[PDB]
Design a protein around this ligand. Structure first.
Ligand code: CLA
Ligand code: CLA
Ligand code: CLA
Ligand code: CLA
Ligand code: CLA
Ligand code: CLA
Ligand SMILES: CCCCCCCCCCCCCCCCCC(=O)OC[C@H](CO[C@@H]1O[C@H](CO)[C@H](O)[C@H](O)[C@H]1O)OC(=O)CCCCCCCCCCCCCCCCC
Ligand SMILES: CC(=O)O[C@H]1CC(C)(C)C(=C=C/C(C)=C/C=C/C(C)=C/C=C/C=C(C)/C=C/C=C(C)/C=C/[C@@]23O[C@]2(C)C[C@@H](O)CC3(C)C)[C@](C)(O)C1
Ligand code: KC1
Ligand code: KC1
Ligand SMILES: CC1=C(C#C/C(C)=C/C=C/C(C)=C/C=C/C=C(C)/C=C/C=C(C)/C=C/[C@@]23O[C@]2(C)C[C@@H](O)CC3(C)C)C(C)(C)C[C@H](O)C1
Lengths: 161, 160, 185, 70, 172
């Protein structure tokens, strides 16, 4: 499985802790886990940098309760103030994104193949496909370390940055 | 009925009563499992009785809500009533898992001390005979010591 | 020859024949000098319910043993807690009419006994034979061979009968005297 | 069925050998078609119709008390 | 040799009505023999419905007693008086209506599985989603569902009992 995946730095198959002794099912499970983790990390790091670069907090997140976009602090303090059913609906959209199609072993969802199709690598060129997915994986790992470091910085410093 | 461990230079077969009737394969299986596990528990309890004095007691919180800095509670009697019941529950739960993750019934590997822990093995040079006789004798000494310090604590009132 | 319960249940049910022995060959006569085939009234003549009688005797003896031990021990040491202290409940016989009701403990014990007895009622009615009787598959430290098994069964029976009689004169010796473990006047 | 038992009995034959670990469901073997047929009986259907009519009249009297719109 | 015993209650033979079901090959816990007198399909349906209801109810109690509350002045009541304030407010009857629709269709499912009009399994409603394709994975997932359901039944029972006894949030 050393020839699978991305390895952008090249020659960088890294089992380090010898995690994969050789089992296709466990490796595919962890590949789905890593690709999902990377997508989540990239999205979260975007939603973490955006409130600071372009503040852009227009209007009330809760017109009835009174929760304003500009009163939720950026970072970890968000999960006390984003409205109750606001968090419920965010969770529900994650549920829709994860439960619309099947992500079980033996299905394309287990490989990360989803219904987004917002890059459409054009199968006639099945060579930029590997580049696109490798870049996605590597960027997901980078934003993975990034987002966990950002959360730790938020916890230690007391605010987002 | 001698060869399966438990025999050493101080005495080979020391049992005036108890196994006096001899034979009794299943009885010796359960008795050997009891001796091995009792020795392990006694070793752990003896070490947990010497650590609070030979070493600095844990500087943490044990109960962060109740501030159990590990020094207010003693070493021995009383600490049972001092450690929170919600923590004794988790201690007994770890014991529960370690005694139900693998089987311990008759004919199983459980009635041998074999719970897949290994770590302190040998190189399989049949010096594991020496290591397992060390198991049994060391556990016997540790259990004599654990109940000796149990009594010592109770009769003196506190740790010593 | 304990006859592992899975194959022992093959001969379960209410046996209609008679073994020709004493009470269906039950262990228990087994006195000091010879065998004390006691049965003076003749309940063992009712051969079909002899396994029922053995189950009842074993259950009574076990409950007794536990109860005698549990009105001997508390007169020395009590459970930690104010409701069980030597001052809140001066005597062990008072412990019944001390918690009861809405204090919790005794009602919880009754509830759990009821649950464990309802769950094991299928053992008494049906799945009960001469050999099974009180065998709830808690053997573990039940010695092998055959005569050792008989010795342990007769030990259990003698201790259970002794504890039944002892508990009788013990609750009696405590109500008429109101004293600690030695219930003499 | 040598032992005299009533018709439509969910009882196993009492003439059995040593204790049997058998499944004897004590619940009526009813049928969905049979239940629908029974609820379509003239007594059942017409009493249900009478109850529906009576309740409809009750509700009309409740929400339109008396004959106010005569 | 015979009479496959209950791995849970080792002194009672396992009820033959348990064969082929998820919790029988490892526990087989039917000491009172309900499956011997009641249809095991109905019993499994009841068990799974109770387990799912309790798994929802436990997290509902957790949320309600942790401050998770809908944005409404009428919703600012404690869990103990929640099912009197919401009963008077109306939403309890609303939940009753919608769950009644769902339960009428569940009744149709039950009264179609028993007559053989469908090959539906007792707990099955068709929601595959996070369902393994491999049969062993399906069995393990069903066992996880059953164990979680039973654990949450007991957990919710304890939660409500202790909350009514000693009015507190949840850790008590
Ligand atoms: C893991 C992904 C993730 C998560 C959990 C959140 C979570 C949150 N975002 Mg967010 N965001 C994300 C990705 C994410 N974002 C991305 C990718 C962008 C770039 C378009 C943004 C841009 C953004 C803005 C501009 C704002 C938020 C805000 C918020 C908070 C209020 C809820 C809301 O309005 O959602 C909005 C979520 C989206 C638009 C993403 C779809 C909430 C804590 C608001 C806030 O007050 O921040 C503290 C706010 O005004 N987000
Ligand atoms: C839980 C205690 C326990 C148990 C179950 C065993 C079990 C066993 N030991 Mg053993 N042993 C123990 C503690 C124990 N040991 C201790 C503490 C010592 C140190 C003196 C030894 C020293 C020892 C030697 C030197 C030998 C054994 C051997 C054996 C095996 C055969 C004898 C037998 O079956 O005895 C069954 C178990 C018992 C009879 C112990 C039951 C406890 C009795 C009934 C009461 C003891 C009371 C105690 C003295 C006072 C405690 C304080 C109290 C007043 C509160 C058997 C596996 C022999 C062996 O390995 O065979 C190959 C052997 O040669 N043991
Ligand atoms: C027939 C069996 C039986 C029954 C019905 C009871 C019933 C009772 N016991 Mg008891 N007990 C028993 C056996 C029994 N015991 C045995 C065998 C022991 C020796 C370990 C004890 C030791 C004991 C103590 C030390 C105390 C009680 C106490 C009590 C009372 C409160 C419940 C409680 O905390 O129990 C606690 C019971 C245990 C911790 C041991 C139960 C072990 C089971 C039987 C196995 C209650 C009337 C308490 C009380 O109010 O004093 C009378 C109390 O302080 N019991
Ligand atoms: C078999 C065990 C046994 C033993 C050793 C004793 C022993 C004793 N009983 Mg006794 N007793 C027993 C069973 C026993 N009893 C039974 C089964 C009952 C019927 C429930 C009684 C009823 C009983 C009464 C009513 C009295 C004794 C008394 C006495 C004491 C004189 C003496 C210590 C007497 C006592 O308390 O001491 C004077 C007394 O008055 N016993
Ligand atoms: C609404 C409650 C409820 C119901 C209807 C069931 C139903 C069932 N359970 Mg179950 N169970 C429950 C709660 C429930 N469970 C809880 C809370 C636990 C946790 C302790 C368990 C733990 C459990 C185990 C460990 C096992 C079962 C099994 C079974 C099945 C056989 C038992 C039987 O004949 O019926 C039981 C009838 C009732 C419980 C009705 C309630 C009676 C009260 C008076 C049956 C489908 C067995 C199985 O999987 O069979 C294949 C099995 O091995 N259950
Ligand atoms: C057995 C399931 C169950 C039941 C009977 C109830 C019952 C109740 N919940 Mg509740 N709840 C549940 C599960 C359940 N909940 C779960 C799983 C969650 C987590 C999402 C919540 C989150 C929740 C909140 C945040 C609030 C309630 C509230 C209430 C009360 C009013 C009804 C309402 O508006 O619900 C609203 C329920 C939801 C919006 C989520 C339910 C969706 C899942 C799928 C069910 C009522 C006592 C309200 C109340 O008045 O409390 C005092 C309230 O503010 N619940
Ligand atoms: C099982 C859960 C137990 C349900 C509680 C008993 C039901 C109850 O009291 O009904 C009480 C509820 C009504 O409950 C009343 O509702 C009034 C609304 O005007 C009040 O506002 C309160 O909600 C309450 O008093 O009755 C019904 O809704 C029963 C019919 C349910 C039909 C569901 C099938 C849908 C098709
Ligand atoms: C102020 C003051 O001073 O009070 C002090 C007092 C004091 C004493 C100093 C204290 C102490 C120290 C302690 C706690 C000392 C330890 C006491 C122990 C370990 C008691 C448990 C015995 C278990 C046994 C014998 C099990 C035995 C099991 C046996 C024998 C099994 C026996 C079998 O027959 C069975 C059951 C089946 C047979 O087939 C096989 C065999 C093995 C023979 C206190 C409590 O802190 C307080
Ligand atoms: C077309 C369907 C639709 C409608 C019609 C709708 C309407 C309302 N949404 Mg919702 N919504 C989605 C769909 C819809 N929302 C989707 C796909 C998402 C992505 C996850 C999403 C997110 C959030 C968040 C994060 C919050 C939120 C709330 C409210 C709210 C206020 C009610 C009130 O103020 O009384 C109203 C009316 C905010 C809130 O205030 O809830 C109290 C809150 O925080 N929504
Ligand atoms: C990774 C899983 C894990 C977590 C996350 C965790 C966390 C906490 N443990 Mg815990 N624990 C284990 C696992 C975990 N513990 C294991 C395997 C053992 C060995 C048996 C063990 C032992 C004890 C003991 C002896 C005590 C204890 C407690 C607390 C406590 C205090 C909270 C509070 O005081 O507010 C918190 C937060 C103390 C207690 O008071 O529990 C309420 C207490 O005395 N723990
Ligand atoms: C075994 C198994 C499982 C399991 C399990 C588990 C965890 C089972 C646990 C079950 C459990 C935990 C059952 C609770 C009993 C507690 C009771 C009965 C409380 C009595 C309490 C009573 C009667 C109250 C007494 C009082 O209130 C009175 C009377 C008035 C008050 O003044 C005083 C008090 C408060 C004292 C899985 C994993 C879930 C599924 C798997 O497949 C099989």
């Amino acid at each position: 499985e050393s020839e699978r995946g991305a390895q952008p730095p090249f020659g960088f198959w890294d089992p380090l802790g010898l995690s994969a002794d050789g089992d296709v099912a466990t490796f595919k499970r962890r590949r789905a886990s890593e690709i999902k983790h990377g997508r989540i990390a990239m999205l979260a790091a975007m939603g973490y940098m955006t409130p600071e670069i372009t503040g852009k907090f227009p209007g009330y997140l809760s017109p009835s309760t009174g929760v304003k976009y500009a009163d939720i602090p950026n970072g970890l303090a968000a999960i006390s103030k984003v409205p109750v059913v606001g968090w419920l609906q965010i969770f529900a959209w994650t549920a829709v994104c994860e439960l619309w199609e099947d992500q079980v072993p033996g299905t394309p969802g287990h490989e990360g193949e989803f219904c987004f199709k917002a890059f459409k690598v054009t199968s006639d060129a099945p060579e930029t496909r590997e580049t696109k997915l490798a870049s996605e994986l590597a960027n997901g790992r980078l934003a993975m370390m990034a987002i966990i470091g950002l959360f730790f910085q938020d916890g230690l410093t007391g605010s987002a940055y | 009925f001698e060869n399966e461990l438990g025999v050493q230079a101080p005495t080979g077969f020391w049992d005036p009563l108890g196994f006096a009737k001899d034979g009794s394969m299943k009885a010796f299986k359960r008795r050997r499992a009891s001796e091995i596990k009792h020795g392990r528990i006694a070793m752990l309890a003896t070490m947990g009785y010497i650590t609070p004095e030979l070493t600095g007691k844990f500087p943490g919180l044990l109960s962060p809500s109740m501030g159990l800095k590990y020094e207010d509670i003693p070493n021995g009697l009383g600490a049972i009533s001092k450690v929170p019941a919600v923590g004794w529950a988790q201690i007994l739960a770890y014991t529960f898992y370690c005694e139900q993750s693998q089987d311990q019934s008759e004919g199983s590997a459980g009635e041998a001390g074999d719970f897949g822990f290994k770590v302190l093995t040998s190189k399989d040079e049949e010096g594991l005979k020496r290591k397992l006789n060390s198991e049994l004798a060391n556990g016997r000494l540790a259990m004599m010591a654990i109940i000796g310090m149990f009594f010592q604590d109770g009769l003196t009132g506190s740790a010593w | 020859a304990r006859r592992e319960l899975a194959v022992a249940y093959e001969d379960a049910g209410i046996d209609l024949m008679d073994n020709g022995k004493f009470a269906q060959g039950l262990v228990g006569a087994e006195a000091a000098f010879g065998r004390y085939e006691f049965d003076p009234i003749g309940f063992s003549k009712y051969t079909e319910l002899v396994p029922w009688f053995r189950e009842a005797e074993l259950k009574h003896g076990r409950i007794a043993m536990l109860a005698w031990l549990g009105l001997v021990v508390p007169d020395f040491v009590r459970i930690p807690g104010e409701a069980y202290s030597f001052e809140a409940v001066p005597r062990v016989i008072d412990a019944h009419d001390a918690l009861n009701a809405d204090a919790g403990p005794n009602f919880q014990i009754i509830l759990f006994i009821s649950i464990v007895e309802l769950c094991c009622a299928k053992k008494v009615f049906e799945w009960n034979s001469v050999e099974t009787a009180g065998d709830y598959n808690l053997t573990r430290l039940f010695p092998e061979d055959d005569e050792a098994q008989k010795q342990m069964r007769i030990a259990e029976l003698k201790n259970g009968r002794l504890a039944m009689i002892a508990f009788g004169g013990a609750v009696t010796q405590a109500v008429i005297t109101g004293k600690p473990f030695p219930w003499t006047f | 069925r040598k032992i005299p038992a009533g018709p439509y009995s969910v009882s196993v034959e009492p003439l059995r050998d040593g204790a049997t670990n058998e499944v004897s469901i004590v619940t009526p073997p009813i049928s969905s078609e049979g239940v629908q047929e029974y609820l379509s009986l003239a007594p059942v259907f017409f009493m249900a119709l009478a109850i529906f009519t009576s309740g409809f009249a009750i509700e009309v009297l409740r929400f339109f008390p008396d004959t106010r719109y005569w | 040799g015979g009479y496959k015993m209950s791995k849970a209650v080792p002194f009672l033979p396992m009820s033959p009505a348990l064969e082929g079901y998820v919790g029988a090959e490892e526990e087989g816990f039917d000491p009172m023999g309900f499956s011997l007198a009641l249809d095991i399909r109905w019993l499994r349906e009841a068990e799974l419905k109770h387990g799912r209801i309790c798994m929802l109810a436990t997290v509902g109690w957790i949320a309600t007693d942790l401050g998770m509350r809908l944005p409404g002045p009428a919703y600012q009541v404690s869990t103990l008086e929640a099912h009197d304030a919401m009963v008077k407010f109306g939403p309890m009857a609303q939940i009753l209506i919608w769950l009644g629709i769902i339960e009428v269709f569940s009744f149709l499912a039950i009264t179609n599985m028993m007559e053989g009009t469908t090959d539906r399994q007792p707990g099955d409603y068709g929601l595959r989603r996070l369902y393994p394709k491999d049969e062993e994975g399906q069995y393990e997932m069903q066992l996880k569902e059953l164990r979680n359901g039973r654990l949450a039944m007991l957990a919710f029972s304890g939660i409500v009992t202790t909350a009514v006894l000693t009015g507190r949030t949840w850790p008590f």
